[PDB]
Design a protein around this ligand. Structure first.
Ligand SMILES: Cc1cc2nc3c(=O)[nH]c(=O)nc-3n(C[C@H](O)[C@H](O)[C@H](O)COP(=O)(O)OP(=O)(O)OC[C@H]3O[C@@H](n4cnc5c(N)ncnc54)[C@H](O)[C@@H]3O)c2cc1C
Ligand SMILES: Cc1cc2nc3c(=O)[nH]c(=O)nc-3n(C[C@H](O)[C@H](O)[C@H](O)COP(=O)(O)OP(=O)(O)OC[C@H]3O[C@@H](n4cnc5c(N)ncnc54)[C@H](O)[C@@H]3O)c2cc1C
Ligand SMILES: *CCN(CCCl)CCC[C@H](C)/N=c1/c2ccc(Cl)cc2[nH]c2ccc(OC)cc12
Ligand SMILES: *CCN(CCCl)CCC[C@H](C)/N=c1/c2ccc(Cl)cc2[nH]c2ccc(OC)cc12
Ligand SMILES: *CCN(CC*)CCC[C@H](C)/N=c1\c2ccc(Cl)cc2[nH]c2ccc(OC)cc12
Ligand SMILES: *CCN(CC*)CCC[C@H](C)/N=c1\c2ccc(Cl)cc2[nH]c2ccc(OC)cc12
Lengths: 483, 484
């Protein structure tokens, strides 16, 4: 009774549905647990990107950024009664919710006006390799409310925050709750070295009350593992200078709820500290358990649904795309996988996604933009690697008072042929700059293609077109220099 | 010939050429300029237009003008303060602008000291013969020689200057030069010109204008920004308008009179009459050739500028010309490039020229514009089949910031026959930054599919560029077609 059934109406899911019903005229059934955003399930029609990810965080970071402009405006002749300055977390949340709602709504209207596309509210799971059930709850015992029969099934259940098993985790929240806080914490602790943690620390630091304080902790050596070491270093000094406290090598042992309502946190090191909020952002895991995978023999690899380059599971006719497959957890990748999938299944040509050289950003303050390999991986796959590095304080920061705001541009190449392996930036507008550069690496651009390009002046980006001599090299993993 | 090279002008092209000749080629270089530090009376100095009355100062100033937007839009995200206490101190802006510029002028001087084979000469430069350059105390060829320089090669890099039209009253008007030194922001100002200088300054004035100030922009043609994509010209016009700037198209000043209160009365050919406290003319720049005494060497002048060939050579051996003076592409980076190419061509093993095609550039208007390649109108005349891909949207933040008129426009033009990208034009915040990597793309002969097969960075405005798959319309032998 259905060609395709997607479990999850997220970015991948919707993309796969839409495409199937429009370019292939297939009867598509789509399942999600909520129509509009917010608790109790947080996610809804639209997925993480829409309800508790990309969209709302960008609105908030944009909000958090105003603290910089309002401070920096002074250096260019802008005055006002700074003592009357206050941030209304409630407004932020209020507008955030309207915006999200309008999108949940817009999505609903979509199913209406689209033929062959039907939406089904409830939890979905596999009965058999061709039977998908919509129940009223995550409990496989709860009441079936629909029994869908189909030839093809696509899994797109996304991921979910991972809460560690430490005593008192019940006193902490994940990123989900954070988008609904009724008031901004005075003292907040964000746990995690990753983007989510970093981004939120930026947000909380801006809308924090009078003697508020944001503390970020990580179990490792320095934040943002997996990113260029120069950015991790620079980002830490900048976040620090903005008044954010970063604890490295610290890992929460237990959280206890004091009488005033505060939370006492005890770190394995023995340190004790109080906080009004404890946000855990240590990881996201594919949401597989509730799918009853066993009822069809679909394999699971590292918590996620195993697939092959074509997004196919081990059971013909059962495909998986997105966060659920644990490859690259970025919205655009999901959307891209879905389209490739759909073509490969109901079209004339099989097509897969290129998970390499994907540009991405971190919306911290200041932000980061990146594409390709970090040196440390590069020197392991190539014998001769050249590193081009640039660091400078943009003019505007010279005059805005934010002298600590250094812009960092780093280019990494395979010295044998000039090919560009990775470009990493730190500084205002980075996310925006990295995009075309993403196209550059798909075109196998080489360093000379950059420096032979005429710069746009004056801009930060033009730095990328003026790096001609490497600062250092890696010869079979060893660091060398030119005498 | 006590000098290998003599550069007249210490701007972007000249400095780059000087530096490269003395450092990579160990040549004795002489460089001349009329002032060491910015400001009146000559405005330009060591550093050139980019440093003293161009790129640098205009970016600082536009940067300042943007705060008006952020200050207004902050309200949308929960930022409150006593808006009635809000004021702009033009004098502060000018104060920090001067310190920044001064520091660079100083950094430049120091460079001449620490660099061997590089010598700086203060004064007006001119040719005596094809191998003799004179430094005089004034622009007048009669003034006192203060130095006689013999050399084997001469580089002309005098740049351009504002062009004041010969209309009655021009003496009551000013140019972009004086604008950087205004002691007070005009209450009613009129900027004359449709170009970038006029548009960029309109936004500056509009942000630091007093209480019931008013900025008026007039252009004699149909719509601002001639030479740029029609969609951007239209959009930009609505957006400037919605911010309180008044734009008069099809108006052409006839005369300016100085009233007794000190205001300036402006009479347009059309007969209209309006009063202003400031009249800024920004109708163009001309290569500075007259004071060089080109005749003493036979160097040819084409359209107001020094004639040169692809290798930047004049008609007289050993006399080269790079930069604004040659009237090709008046951008800082183009000048810098021509100089390096020139220097390699003359004192190096290999001849090299600059590619004046596909050069990215921007207009620091509010919002700004970023562009690269051909505009449809020119495309449809060189190619039989042209596809125009067009996107328009109000970014998320502008939905919530209260600036709903700030639409983002992305436009991609291609040669439909093979998919090659001919031009990319953007309008919206951060466009200038977005266009750069895009400039690299067209140097690599990218094609529309290379864009859309790229995974986007989300969420950002730039990502739109990677998601335009179907053309909105085409140009078939200049006619506009569409798919039924
Ligand atoms: C705080 C945060 C910020 C982020 N910011 C960015 C960013 O700036 N840029 C970026 O590229 N990425 C960002 N991401 C990641 C990006 O959102 C994800 O990579 C992407 O949404 C994954 O999409 P998906 O379709 O695979 O999953 P989803 O959008 O996660 O969709 C999964 C859907 O499945 C539903 N579902 C679950 N199981 C069932 C079931 N059994 N029955 C019915 N429905 C079910 C869920 O309710 C959900 O709606 C962010 C993520 C987070 C958490
Ligand atoms: C208001 C404004 C804004 C601009 N903004 C930008 C921008 O944002 N981006 C961009 O790319 N471009 C911009 N430009 C243009 C850019 O500044 C020029 O294209 C570039 O400076 C030209 O460099 P040049 O070396 O050829 O000229 P210059 O820097 O103009 O050098 C000419 C020098 O020669 C000296 N000179 C003149 N004749 C003599 C003589 N006879 N003897 C001795 N010395 C002499 C002068 O004093 C001057 O310092 C802008 C221009 C203006 C006017
Ligand atoms: C997470 C934010 N979105 C990205 C740009 Cl819309 C959602 C992506 C999912 C998928 C691409 N959805 C859409 C939608 C969904 C719903 C409506 Cl009402 C309109 C949409 N328009 C889209 C336009 C272009 C897309 O390609 C990236 C995707 C769209
Ligand atoms: C107009 C703004 N500048 C561009 C980047 Cl510095 C001036 C460009 C002119 C020429 C390229 N000059 C320089 C200088 C000049 C003086 C000093 Cl003290 C340092 C410079 N450093 C440069 C570094 C890199 C350049 O390549 C674009 C140019 C430089
Ligand atoms: C009433 C009709 N609309 C709702 C208001 C339906 C929404 C249609 C838009 C066009 N949706 C999508 C897309 C449009 C255009 C392109 Cl090129 C791609 C595209 N992809 C998706 C993918 C998923 C999806 O689900 C919401 C919608 C669209
Ligand atoms: C005391 C030594 N310095 C002054 C403080 C001299 C300035 C040297 C810098 C490096 N100047 C220039 C350049 C540096 C590096 C590169 Cl790769 C290029 C380069 N080009 C130019 C061109 C012109 C110029 O004149 C000011 C300087 C530099």
């Amino acid at each position: 009774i259905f060609d395709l059934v997607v479990i999850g109406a997220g970015s991948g899911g919707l993309e796969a549905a839409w495409n199937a019903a429009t370019l292939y005229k297939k009867r598509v059934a789509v399942i999600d647990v909520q129509m509009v955003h917010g608790p109790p399930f947080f996610s809804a029609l639209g997925g993480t990107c829409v309800n508790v990810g990309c969209v709302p965080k960008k609105l908030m970071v944009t909000g958090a950024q105003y603290m910089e402009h309002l401070r920096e405006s002074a250096g260019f002749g802008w005055e006002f009664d700074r003592t009357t300055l206050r941030a209304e977390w409630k407004n932020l949340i209020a507008v955030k919710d309207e915006a999200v709602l309008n999108i949940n709504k817009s999505y609903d209207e979509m199913f209406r006006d689209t033929e062959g596309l039907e939406f089904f509210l409830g939890w979905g799971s596999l009965e058999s390799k061709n039977v998908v059930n919509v129940r009223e709850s995550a409990d496989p015992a709860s009441a079936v409310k629909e029994r869908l029969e189909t030839e093809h099934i696509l899994l797109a259940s996304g991921s979910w925050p991972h809460m560690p098993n430490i005593p008192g985790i019940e006193h902490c929240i994940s990123s989900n709750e954070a988008f609904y806080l009724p008031e901004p914490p005075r003292r907040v602790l964000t746990v995690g070295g990753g983007f989510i943690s970093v981004e939120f620390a930026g947000i909380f630091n801006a809308y924090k009350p009078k003697d508020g304080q944001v503390t970020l902790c990580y179990r490792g050596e320095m934040i943002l593992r997996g990113f260029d070491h120069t950015l991790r270093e620079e980002l830490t000094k900048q976040l620090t200078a903005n008044g954010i406290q970063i604890l490295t090598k610290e890992n929460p042992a237990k959280v206890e709820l004091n009488a005033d309502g505060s939370k006492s946190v005890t770190f394995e090191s023995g340190k004790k500290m109080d906080f009004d909020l404890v946000m855990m952002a240590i990881g996201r895991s594919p949401r597989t358990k509730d799918l009853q995978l066993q009822n069809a023999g679909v394999m699971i690899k590292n918590g996620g649904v195993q697939v092959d380059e074509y997004s196919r599971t081990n059971v013909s006719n059962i495909y998986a795309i997105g966060d659920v497959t644990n490859r690259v957890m970025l919205t655009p990748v999901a959307i891209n996988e879905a389209a490739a999938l759909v073509d490969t299944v109901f079209g004339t040509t099989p097509r897969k996604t290129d998970h390499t050289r994907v540009a991405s950003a971190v919306f911290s303050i200041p932000p980061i933009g990146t594409c390709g390999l970090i040196e440390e991986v590069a020197s392991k796959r190539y014998e001769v690697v050249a590193v081009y590095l640039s660091s400078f304080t943009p003019l505007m920061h010279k005059v805005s008072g934010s002298k600590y705001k250094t812009f960092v541009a780093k280019i990494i190449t395979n010295h044998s042929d000039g090919t560009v392996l990775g470009v990493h930036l730190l500084g205002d507008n980075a996310p925006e700059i990295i995009q075309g550069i993403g196209i550059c690496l798909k075109l196998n651009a080489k360093i000379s293609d950059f420096y032979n390009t005429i710069g746009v002046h004056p801009t930060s980006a033009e730095e990328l077109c003026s790096m001609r001599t490497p600062s250092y090299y890696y010869v079979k993993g060893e660091k060398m220099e030119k005498p």
